[PDB]
Design an enzyme around this catalytic site. Structure first.
Site, PDB file in Angstrom:
ATOM      1  N   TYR C  54      42.507  52.741  42.228  1.00  0.00           N
ATOM      2  CA  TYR C  54      42.831  51.336  42.150  1.00  0.00           C
ATOM      3  C   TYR C  54      42.945  50.731  43.549  1.00  0.00           C
ATOM      4  CZ  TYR C  54      45.778  47.183  41.236  1.00  0.00           C
ATOM      5  OH  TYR C  54      46.262  45.922  41.122  1.00  0.00           O
ATOM      6  N   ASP C  68      51.786  38.779  50.120  1.00  0.00           N
ATOM      7  CA  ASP C  68      50.953  38.675  48.936  1.00  0.00           C
ATOM      8  C   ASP C  68      51.100  37.269  48.354  1.00  0.00           C
ATOM      9  OD1 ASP C  68      49.465  39.227  46.613  1.00  0.00           O
ATOM     10  OD2 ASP C  68      50.943  40.581  45.728  1.00  0.00           O
ATOM     11  N   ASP C  95      41.783  44.628  41.899  1.00  0.00           N
ATOM     12  CA  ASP C  95      42.557  43.425  41.681  1.00  0.00           C
ATOM     13  C   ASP C  95      41.774  42.242  42.251  1.00  0.00           C
ATOM     14  OD1 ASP C  95      44.532  41.397  41.740  1.00  0.00           O
ATOM     15  OD2 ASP C  95      46.077  42.670  42.655  1.00  0.00           O
ATOM     16  N   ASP C  97      42.919  39.031  41.670  1.00  0.00           N
ATOM     17  CA  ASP C  97      43.874  37.933  41.606  1.00  0.00           C
ATOM     18  C   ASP C  97      43.460  36.968  40.491  1.00  0.00           C
ATOM     19  OD1 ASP C  97      45.962  38.687  43.611  1.00  0.00           O
ATOM     20  OD2 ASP C  97      44.251  38.717  44.974  1.00  0.00           O
ATOM     21  N   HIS C 122      40.548  43.380  37.551  1.00  0.00           N
ATOM     22  CA  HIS C 122      41.520  42.605  36.809  1.00  0.00           C
ATOM     23  C   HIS C 122      41.729  41.223  37.411  1.00  0.00           C
ATOM     24  CE1 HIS C 122      45.239  43.139  39.147  1.00  0.00           C
ATOM     25  NE2 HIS C 122      44.909  44.433  39.309  1.00  0.00           N
ATOM     26  N   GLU C 124      43.986  37.434  36.531  1.00  0.00           N
ATOM     27  CA  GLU C 124      45.271  37.129  35.910  1.00  0.00           C
ATOM     28  C   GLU C 124      45.444  35.634  35.644  1.00  0.00           C
ATOM     29  OE1 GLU C 124      48.357  38.465  38.645  1.00  0.00           O
ATOM     30  OE2 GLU C 124      47.798  36.922  40.094  1.00  0.00           O
ATOM     31  N   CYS C 132      49.136  21.863  48.764  1.00  0.00           N
ATOM     32  CA  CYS C 132      49.129  22.498  50.072  1.00  0.00           C
ATOM     33  C   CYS C 132      50.445  23.221  50.383  1.00  0.00           C
ATOM     34  CB  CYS C 132      48.766  21.487  51.152  1.00  0.00           C
ATOM     35  SG  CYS C 132      48.618  22.239  52.788  1.00  0.00           S
ATOM     36  N   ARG C 166      44.716  40.236  32.938  1.00  0.00           N
ATOM     37  CA  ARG C 166      46.097  40.532  33.246  1.00  0.00           C
ATOM     38  C   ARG C 166      46.906  39.298  32.889  1.00  0.00           C
ATOM     39  NH1 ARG C 166      48.772  42.052  39.271  1.00  0.00           N
ATOM     40  NH2 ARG C 166      50.914  42.089  38.496  1.00  0.00           N
ATOM     41  N   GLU C 196      52.598  43.903  32.749  1.00  0.00           N
ATOM     42  CA  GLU C 196      53.715  44.627  33.342  1.00  0.00           C
ATOM     43  C   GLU C 196      54.241  45.672  32.350  1.00  0.00           C
ATOM     44  OE1 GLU C 196      57.070  41.650  33.663  1.00  0.00           O
ATOM     45  OE2 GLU C 196      55.362  40.375  33.017  1.00  0.00           O
ATOM     46  N   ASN C 218      51.764  48.669  33.899  1.00  0.00           N
ATOM     47  CA  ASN C 218      51.887  48.641  35.350  1.00  0.00           C
ATOM     48  C   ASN C 218      53.207  49.257  35.820  1.00  0.00           C
ATOM     49  OD1 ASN C 218      50.920  48.220  37.885  1.00  0.00           O
ATOM     50  ND2 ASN C 218      51.696  46.102  38.009  1.00  0.00           N
TER      51      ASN C 218
END
Ligand SMILES: [Cl-]
Ligand SMILES: [Cl-]
Lengths: 287, 300, 300, 287
Positions: C54, C68, C95, C97, C122, C124, C132, C166, C196, C218
């Protein structure tokens, strides 16, 4: 389905001869596609010169790979890529082959020029011994898929004449090279001999402004050539056109005089297949 | 530090890209900025004697075979910018669209463009936050949203580096609304302003005096907007004139023509008159200086 | 085509990355998927005998020294994915996003991940289109917006390539709302579902039977969610268990410790017991096979 | 203000000795920074091995440059980068220097190993003649800024003994090399002689599991060494930690046993300086 390397092998077979045009970037590849070419080419010198660098082996696998990836992202048309001498020893060659495959490249060409040179060694056209080039070819063949096409390029005609060139080429084929690449021979009647001796499909390089001449596709095919490469043709014309626009703007303070010489927005949209983007959003969503 | 003017050692300050751009904008009347899609084009522009060059956002996308629909990201444009600045110190202005995301993405864009030795960027007041299946549109964000974008950029930029606020509001909201946005953008910390070519060159003195900072007029082709000469635009208070795609459009027509020639005639004979000479190519690449360098430094 | 099982030539179909992932999910009970932040880690995971690996989105950002916060783009994750798939054919889940933008950006993400020989992605149901200066948030998009994202991806994906939807809705909207979203995501064309770790392992049979497609739990650390064993999760109808950051967190503590040792003692003596041996390194890199290859192909 | 190359020169001067730690990625660089190191290092073998490749010169300028860019984006701490033999001839060396400068790299090291080898040539530790390495150094110096630090690495001690090594090193300094890099000498009492003979700041390479020993920083400084490099130390420990976690998960079906050995989320947030992002948005906007 159809693997890049297969599509290239097939094109080489069903075309007489296969015309392969240089395209320096994805948009040029799309133009070439639109005109109906069956294969395209990424020139090593093209990669360097487009970066503003001389074709002196300064560029590496990453420079060529990035430009190749850009092209193959935009088109499935089989792409042949100049890998010079393979950018290093056995494992670098192997890396080059594997990365070109991952990039959906159909074929590469690798040549029998020397690489291993002192820091300050001057630009030259010196050949490695036949054995050194055999080693290069073995390194590549060891990792390549069956479909993927390895073209051995010899630069030996200019330096060693037709016989020595046929001798190298034949040894290159038995080392596992799928096809052969030679400069345009000085005499089109050298070709039948050359082609029948090496048996595998042969590429004639139609450069401009070089030592070598131009022949037509039909002419070269009739003399036993199966691929004809136009490595820089479009690029040279693009450069003249750009320079003219720049000169116009600088001299006249406006680009009016250049407008007749520009592709129309409408043609640009068509090459980019812009309508299909609009239709896709209508086909999938609402509002 | 000091540089010789002839035999005389005088003060000279080395200039940062962003300074070189500010200086070019000052000493040129007006500054012509030409689009170049790649390093070779940038060298041609340099050879013709342009003082600034430009990396077009639509140019980056279209050269990748993509429509100019906000698909490309920081990395696409950054790579093409890096390629150009590697080849030339001529000050480069780069299109960063709307900044590729929120505050910290904008910040990243500014910082990376600086590290790539870029002199200036432009960032615009178009909507970015579009639903997944939103159709291609020319929607503006409210003035406050664009102010926030500019604050994000200004927060991280060096002093010299130039931030150009681009408004697309003229076409949709007319001259007044456009002056209002632009003035707010200047006070949010925009160094310069970028607008389409105004439909009436006599709207320019008003526009330029109201925003005070150097103004860029965008000389596009095949759009809604007209063409004027550089002299004309400078006389109406414009300090930069951009030619974003001009060379590229000509390059494409030329490439297509060569392809068509080769396909129809089976050889490129007819195309040869329309090709740059190998000798010209070598000169633009400054090939001789490579040979001379090896002679200057080594033996044999 | 045919492969020998011993002396016997039998049918064997070569599998595409996405097939290898589907097959791993089938023959493993459940499939454990470990995060690896780089190619070397992927080789360690392979050496231990994991069947899938992963590439974590937060891992990509944090390894770059970034929070993140959706700063990173397609190119950041694609480069790290390419590095891994170059080194190993072990099926890699990545991932992506929210897909990095609208419909055509999603499409580009899918296509490029396929070209990089990635087996699965994945994507989500978090909000992307943020003003902004929007603060870090765990807002969901409405179910329809996420459906559109999935349609965009499915439109371009090959058959074998796996799209995992996800949802982050459990924590904020509870089990029912989560089952509702997930089911809609499956019918929009999601191949598998990622949620999750549920707060109660006895909520899993309900969740899994309702969505029918293979479900991923997860197993994060230091979050809100608990840990269960793989056997436990499989017994409750879970088919994938992900360990997204586990190795990375341990690597960081180890690196810090070495740094602290060197700084405090002026030498790394104390750290030596905690270092992989050069011999182990050479073995994971399969160094010998390089020597053998040169002997197998050349002379001297 | 402060140029990377200056910051490195300064650190070399005001530290006794300067400890330079390898960091394979930006996050490791931030850890090293947090621990208070003054300089950081990008190992060539680290670049290769992190890519899952042996340290056999397969990687090129782009592989190292990308990893360097990632680090310098996250930290201003002066970074030294291994450029092996410079990835090719004069102009490739020049490209390497110019690109490292653009990437905000402070220093590079380049070494006197042979590169120019047949396709199938076996892994070796062979030296180029002193003149070849002089050429390499000249190529680099020709383009480098004044501040930017070029470190000549010699691998000749192991093969040619201390005297021949001092002879090469001195010639390298007069060819324009700013500083010298040698393996850890077999005897710490060889160092005062070596250092006073070459005059320029000297780097001792503290590798693990090699032929060479370990000494303390104080010890090496007292014997006239001004830089001490820990090229792979953190990396080796990271690998053991990762493997242990993987083994735990595989054997126990859960990562419970590994939790004591993980950096806390809180510590991770602090290293990333997460709070400053929250505070920045509060400082600049509202709502
Ligand atoms: Cl004077
Ligand atoms: Cl059989």
């Amino acid at each position: 389905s159809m693997s890049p390397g297969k599509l290239f092998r097939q094109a080489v077979a069903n075309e007489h001869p296969l015309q392969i045009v240089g395209a320096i970037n994805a948009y040029c590849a799309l133009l070439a596609e639109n005109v109906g070419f069956k294969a395209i080419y990424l020139s090593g010198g093209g990669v360097a010169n487009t970066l503003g660098l001389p074709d002196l082996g300064i560029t590496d696998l990453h420079d060529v790979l990035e430009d190749a990836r850009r092209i193959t992202a935009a088109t499935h048309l089989p792409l042949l890529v100049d890998i010079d001498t393979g950018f290093g020893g056995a494992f670098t060659i192997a890396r080059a082959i594997k990365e070109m495959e991952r990039a959906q490249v159909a074929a590469v060409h690798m040549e029998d020029q020397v690489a291993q040179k002192r820091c300050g060694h001057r630009p030259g056209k010196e050949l490695v011994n036949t054995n050194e080039m055999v080693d290069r070819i073995k390194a590549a063949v060891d990792v390549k898929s069956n479909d993927f096409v390895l073209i051995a390029r010899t630069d030996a005609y200019a330096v060693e004449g037709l016989k020595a060139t046929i001798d190298r080429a034949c040894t290159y084929v038995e080392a596992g090279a799928d096809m052969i690449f030679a400069e345009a021979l000085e005499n089109i009647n050298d070709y039948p001999t050359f082609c029948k001796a090496v048996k595998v499909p042969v590429l004639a390089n139609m450069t401009e402004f070089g030592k070598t001449p131009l022949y037509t596709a039909a002419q070269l095919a009739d003399h036993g050539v199966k691929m004809v490469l136009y490595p820089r043709s479009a690029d040279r014309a693009m450069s003249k056109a750009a320079l003219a626009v720049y000169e116009d703007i600088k001299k006249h303070g406006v680009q009016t005089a250049s407008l007749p010489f520009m592709q129309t927005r409408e043609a640009l949209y068509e090459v980019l297949n812009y309508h299909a983007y609009e239709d896709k959003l209508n086909q999938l969503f609402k509002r």
